[PDB]
Amino acid sequence: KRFVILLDDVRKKFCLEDVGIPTPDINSQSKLILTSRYREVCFQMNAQRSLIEMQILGNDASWELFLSKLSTETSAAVEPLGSQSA
Amino acid sequence: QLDAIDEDYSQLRKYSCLGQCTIHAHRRASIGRRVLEALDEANKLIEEGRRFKKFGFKPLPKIVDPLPQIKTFGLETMLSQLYDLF
Amino acid sequence: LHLKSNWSDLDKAKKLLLAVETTVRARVTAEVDKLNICDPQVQVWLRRVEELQLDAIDEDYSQLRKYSCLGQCTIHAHRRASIGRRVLEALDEANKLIEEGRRFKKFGFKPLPKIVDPLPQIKTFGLETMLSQLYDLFEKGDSNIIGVWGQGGVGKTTLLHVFNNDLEKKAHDYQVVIFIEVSNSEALNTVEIQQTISERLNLPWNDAEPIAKRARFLIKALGR
Amino acid sequence: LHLKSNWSDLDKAKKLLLAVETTVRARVTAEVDKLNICDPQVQVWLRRVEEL
Numbered sequence A: 001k002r003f004v005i006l007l008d009d010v011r012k013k014f015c016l017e018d019v020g021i022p023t024p025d026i027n028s029q030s031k032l033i034l035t036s037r038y039r040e041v042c043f044q045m046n047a048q049r050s051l052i053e054m055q056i057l058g059n060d061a062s063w064e065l066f067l068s069k070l071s072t073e074t075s076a077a078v079e080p081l082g083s084q085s086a
Numbered sequence B: 001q002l003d004a005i006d007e008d009y010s011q012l013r014k015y016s017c018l019g020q021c022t023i024h025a026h027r028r029a030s031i032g033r034r035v036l037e038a039l040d041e042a043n044k045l046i047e048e049g050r051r052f053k054k055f056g057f058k059p060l061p062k063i064v065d066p067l068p069q070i071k072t073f074g075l076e077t078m079l080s081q082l083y084d085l086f
Numbered sequence C: 001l002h003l004k005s006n007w008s009d010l011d012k013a014k015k016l017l018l019a020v021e022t023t024v025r026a027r028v029t030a031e032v033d034k035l036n037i038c039d040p041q042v043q044v045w046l047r048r049v050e051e052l053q054l055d056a057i058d059e060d061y062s063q064l065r066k067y068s069c070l071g072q073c074t075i076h077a078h079r080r081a082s083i084g085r086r087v088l089e090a091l092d093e094a095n096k097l098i099e100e101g102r103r104f105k106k107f108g109f110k111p112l113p114k115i116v117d118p119l120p121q122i123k124t125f126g127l128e129t130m131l132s133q134l135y136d137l138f139e140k141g142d143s144n145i146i147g148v149w150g151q152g153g154v155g156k157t158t159l160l161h162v163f164n165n166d167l168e169k170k171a172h173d174y175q176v177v178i179f180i181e182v183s184n185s186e187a188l189n190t191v192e193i194q195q196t197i198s199e200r201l202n203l204p205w206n207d208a209e210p211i212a213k214r215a216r217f218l219i220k221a222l223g224r
Numbered sequence D: 001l002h003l004k005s006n007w008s009d010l011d012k013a014k015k016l017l018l019a020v021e022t023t024v025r026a027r028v029t030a031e032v033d034k035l036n037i038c039d040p041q042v043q044v045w046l047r048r049v050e051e052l
């Protein structure tokens, strides 16, 4: 089958064939996406040529994420625009 | 739709006061054969649905099953990068 | 005049046949998912359902309906003669297919083991010249026991993986290619080696059988 | 003649016979793998299929 395996939060190098997952190759259409905190682990798992860095949130998006976390009355204190308050 | 013949038979009941008249024999001829046309089907449906022993089959797994869909802010740019590799 | 009722019964049979076929195909797909192959008798039944093409007579009957306005005359009765016998020709086949596919109990059979099953195919560099040396004995060498030696990490195991996977590309007279990992221990974990051989020879695993008795059995089995 | 219908049913029987024979041979090959010998009654049946 043409599978896609999303491998979440790997913390050590492990062998795919020992867990049952075949390593995808160029001849096969299958993909395998793994996430980890360590670039060393992603290099050990042969993902060096397709590495993506998960960067922190932007200045604007970090604020509206903070806004959605506040209660209705608390948000109304820091929501208002046009006027400026401390 | 067994109620259809019931209404058709219901009108013949009003003509049943002189059912031996050749004019009303036109309706009585049809009903006398239409009842048998729906009686055998009704009885066949009895012995079929009374004979079932399994009523459902487990469907094949979905291609991709949904995962927790939380509200996300500012994730469009990074998700675009991931798809550009995938 | 039996066509008006028989064609109605054909529609019931057709819609029931699609239901039985759907059950069989879903049941067969659950077998192919287990790497089994669809049973040959089921495959014949499925192929007959596909080839039936019940929509062909439906269109032919649809044209007779337009001729049905004055079908009593011999001008339009020519079409009605064929349909009145063609419906029964497809009704009995449809009903026969109903009671055949409803009578299946096994839908797949486990295929025989492959001559050589693929092993991990990693990207290898500069291994062509050594693989040529290994093949030069395997094809031509006088002794039937071949030994490959080298320091740790030089590529001995990877040579076997690329050698085993290369056999399935070429043509050879051999019947089974077994890859056994004796590296598990220096204590020779005999049971797990016999499991690999028996699984590769399509043999049943008699768990309680003593090791010495199995070893005598495998010698006879591998000797064939 | 009635040949036009009988020969059509022969084709169905032939393709079904090849399916039953395939099941039997695969079942027999699973027996020879256990060093057993093909059952004499099955061997007679198989030999008649080949000779057909």
Ligand SMILES: Nc1ncnc2c1ncn2[C@@H]1O[C@H](COP(=O)(O)OP(=O)(O)OP(=O)(O)O)[C@@H](O)[C@H]1O
Pocket (backbone or CB within 6 Å): C122, C123, C124, C125, C126, C127, C151, C152, C153, C154, C155, C156, C157, C158
């Ligand atoms: N030609 C090659 N190209 C790329 N990598 C290779 C090649 N030959 C061996 N390797 C690498 O060598 C690594 C060491 O494992 P390998 O199977 O080669 O060991 P080995 O020679 O059997 O040694 P030992 O079993 O003593 O550890 C493997 O991860 C494999 O990727």
